[PDB]
Structures are given as structure tokens and as C-alpha cells.
Specification:
This protein is 30% helix and 19% strand. The chain has nine helices and eleven strands. The chain is globular and about 55 Å long. A seven-stranded mixed sheet has the order 7-6-5-8-9-11-10, sandwiched between helices. Strands 1-3 form a two-stranded antiparallel sheet. A two-stranded antiparallel ribbon has the order 2-4. InterPro entries: Hemolysin_A/TlyA (IPR004538), RNA_MeTrfase_FtsJ_dom (IPR002877), S4_RNA-bd (IPR002942), S4_RNA-bd_sf (IPR036986), SAM-dependent_MTases_sf (IPR029063), TlyA (IPR047048).
Length: 275
């Protein structure tokens, strides 16, 4: 049978809370609910299938996983359409971003992940989806994408820098194609700048965004916009959203915006905590 884990620990592992102790308190406070049926968990130690998608009480969620909220925000704040497009979801995991793109009219989604048996079957088996698991995107070649190259890409990967994804993406994405990238300071910052794998400092967030935007341009992408992700990554990490475009004349359209985006992010997460 599917292995089982405590609800509280699973909520922590999925990033709903920053620590296991906070997760236990959160379940006790009725804050953890099942994504599929919306029912609250009452016992922190209830053992459930380790594939169970969880969310916080009151999160309005249309997708198979809470991570879809990240791409949902990005499509709205960058005014992006995927209607009738061939798209690629890099780091597809259980399917949140793929689901977002299907619901927003994508013609085809290549759902790429380095893991095994992650994508939920309703998405795997969708006529618009091409699941490509056990696939390391750093080694992508255009021949692998047999139904057409994509014109839109989403990236949400862990334990690797975008520095290792963007050059591969430049081989696969069509010229003029748009990208939404999750920029995760905990996987971008120097080993010296990372505190339990947590980057708390607004100054290090700014430096990460400067570094990432610069290498995006090096690899042939304009930076068209920046925002912050609506939910935290693991261990309370604030994450950012970057809107890129593949172009022969790349530039950073928003150099002076980094300090403000980092400030807004810290404000929103400070006011979320106090609430």
C-alpha cells in the first residue's frame, strides 16, 4: 500500500508550516484541510497516504495541488495567456501547474519531472498532456518534444538553480516564447548566505534577484516582469516569480523593480503571520 505519514508531518513536508511543531499546532487549530474534499483534519497524528494533497483552511484552490496557486498568480500579474498553446511544465510533480495550464486553455502540456510516478492519473491520461517523468531537464534536447516545441514554459524546481535550467530551455522554447520561473532563494544563494535552508534577509533576496535576472539575460531571455509567489516554499522561504521572454535581444526591462518586489513580499508575509 501507499506509505503513510502523520498529517502534521505531511503538512510540514508540503510547506504549509515552517516546522513540524508548528504543523501539529496548525492541525490542532483546524487549519489543515484535504484538497480533494475540503474536510478538516482533527488529529495531528492520523496516518494518511503520503500522496495526499493538503491545503490551508480558506485557500481557494481550483487545482490538484496547492502549488497551482503560484502559476495562477503569475498568469494574472503578468497578464499571460496560454490559450491554444503548446506548453512545458518543468518540475510538474503531482500536476498543479499542468492543471492550471489545462484550465487556461493550453493545447498541449509536456509535463516534465525528474521523479517517478508523481503526476496524478487524471492528468497523465488527459489527451492534452504528455507526461515525461524520470526526465532531467538539464539534458533536454528538441528531438524529445515530438508534437511541436513549446511557446510557454513554467519552471518550479527544487534543489537546483535556474542557472542549470535556462540554457536547456533556450534549446527547446521557441523564439518569442514566454516563461514563468519560480525563483527560490534557498536554491540560488551562496552556501554562506543560507541560514535550516532558510533565506530570511531582504538584502540576500535582492542579490538573488539581481543574479538571476542577469544570467537570464546571458542565456537569451529578457526579464519582462517580477513579482512574488503567493505562498511560501519550504521552511518559510519567500519565493519570487519571474516573467521571461526568449529573444535575440535580451534585456532586463525592470532592473529598478527588485527592491520594491522584495519589500512587498516581506510586507505580505509579515501581515499574513500577524493575521
Amino acid at each position: 500500500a501507499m506509505p503513510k505519514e502523520r498529517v502534521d508531518v505531511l503538512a510540514y513536508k508540503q510547506g504549509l508550516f515552517e516546522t513540524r511543531e508548528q504543523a501539529k499546532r496548525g492541525v490542532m487549530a483546524g487549519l489543515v484541510v484535504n484538497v480533494i474534499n475540503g474536510e478538516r483534519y482533527d488529529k495531528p497524528g492520523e496516518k494518511i497516504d503520503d500522496g495526499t494533497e493538503l491545503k490551508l483552511k480558506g485557500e481557494k484552490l481550483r487545482y490538484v495541488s496547492r502549488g497551482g496557486l503560484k502559476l495562477e498568480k503569475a498568469l494574472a500579474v503578468f497578464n499571460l495567456s496560454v490559450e491554444d498553446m503548446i506548453t512545458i511544465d518543468i518540475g510538474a510533480s503531482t500536476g498543479g501547474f499542468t492543471d492550471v495550464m489545462l484550465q487556461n486553455g493550453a493545447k498541449l502540456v509536456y509535463a516534465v519531472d525528474v521523479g517517478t510516478n508523481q503526476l496524478v492519473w487524471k492528468l497523465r491520461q488527459d489527451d492534452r498532456v504528455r507526461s515525461m517523468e524520470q526526465y532531467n531537464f538539464r539534458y533536454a534536447e528538441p528531438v524529445d518534444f515530438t508534437e511541436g516545441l513549446p511557446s510557454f514554459a513554467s519552471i518550479d524546481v527544487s534543489f537546483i538553480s535556474l542557472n542549470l535550467i535556462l540554457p536547456a530551455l533556450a534549446k527547446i522554447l521557441v523564439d518569442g516564447g514566454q516563461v514563468v520561473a519560480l525563483v527560490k532563494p534557498q536554491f540560488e544563494a551562496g552556501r554562506e548566505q543560507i541560514g535550516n535552508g532558510i533565506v530570511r534577509e531582504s538584502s540576500i533576496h535582492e542579490k538573488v534577484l539581481e543574479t538571476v535576472t542577469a544570467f537570464a539575460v546571458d542565456y537569451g531571455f529578457s526579464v519582462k516582469g517580477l513579482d512574488f509567489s503567493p505562498i511560501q516554499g519550504g521552511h518559510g522561504n519567500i519565493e519570487f516569480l519571474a516573467h521571461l521572454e526568449k529573444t535575440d535581444s535580451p534585456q532586463n526591462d525592470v532592473p529598478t523593480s527588485i527592491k520594491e518586489v522584495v519589500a512587498q513580499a516581506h510586507k505580505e508575509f509579515k501581515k499574513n503571520e500577524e493575521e
